[PDB]
Amino acid sequence: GSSGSSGLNDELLGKVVSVVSATERTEWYPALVISPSCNDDITVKKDQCLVRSFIDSKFYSIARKDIKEVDILNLPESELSTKPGLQKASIFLKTRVVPDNWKMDISEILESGPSSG
């Protein structure tokens, strides 16, 4: 089980992050940073980056200056058990595998085992 496939390795990107609201520095939501590969029209400012929400799973364009490391997998079961954007996010921090609803580039790699059998 290896299947060489380097999908741009990063520390901040490809991981869950907390987005700080511009209308409320307090309010923050989880989002899986990503790059506009498929989406073209999606114009990402120079000080902006594409992310993947863990609530509705929508594509938002925030500023990296609004993002900041977070501990979703460190959150209490109370927050996760409740907060969705967190839970899912956390799940991806434990299961390290987004839902088929995302289909990043692993959910498919799953398949029926390594290669039939």
Side-chain angles (χ1 to χ4, degrees):
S2 267
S3 206
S5 251
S6 49
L8 307 163
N9 264 292
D10 223 273
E11 75 192 66
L12 262 178
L13 133 77
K15 86 113 82 170
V16 165
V17 292
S18 45
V19 184
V20 190
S21 220
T23 283
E24 29 183 353
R25 298 254 185 161
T26 274
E27 248 269 57
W28 75 265
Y29 97 91
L32 188 55
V33 167
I34 42 153
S35 169
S37 217
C38 208
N39 293 330
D40 232 346
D41 265 272
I42 299 285
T43 279
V44 173
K45 273 101 222 250
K46 219 261 202 126
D47 273 270
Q48 279 190 11
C49 237
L50 180 60
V51 306
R52 209 141 188 189
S53 189
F54 279 107
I55 297 173
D56 193 33
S57 176
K58 283 267 281 273
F59 284 99
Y60 291 98
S61 28
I62 356 298
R64 297 265 276 193
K65 60 143 279 111
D66 325 319
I67 305 159
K68 49 98 90 182
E69 265 140 299
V70 75
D71 249 349
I72 309 321
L73 229 208
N74 231 273
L75 277 165
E77 263 115 66
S78 227
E79 286 308 316
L80 313 178
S81 178
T82 62
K83 264 79 142 83
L86 296 170
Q87 183 119 64
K88 272 263 89 261
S90 338
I91 286 188
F92 166 75
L93 286 205
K94 10 166 55 191
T95 67
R96 311 292 283 176
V97 61
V98 272
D100 182 88
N101 232 340
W102 297 37
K103 231 224 289 249
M104 188 62 69
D105 219 36
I106 158 155
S107 70
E108 273 199 318
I109 295 175
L110 241 159
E111 230 236 305
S112 208
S115 186
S116 249

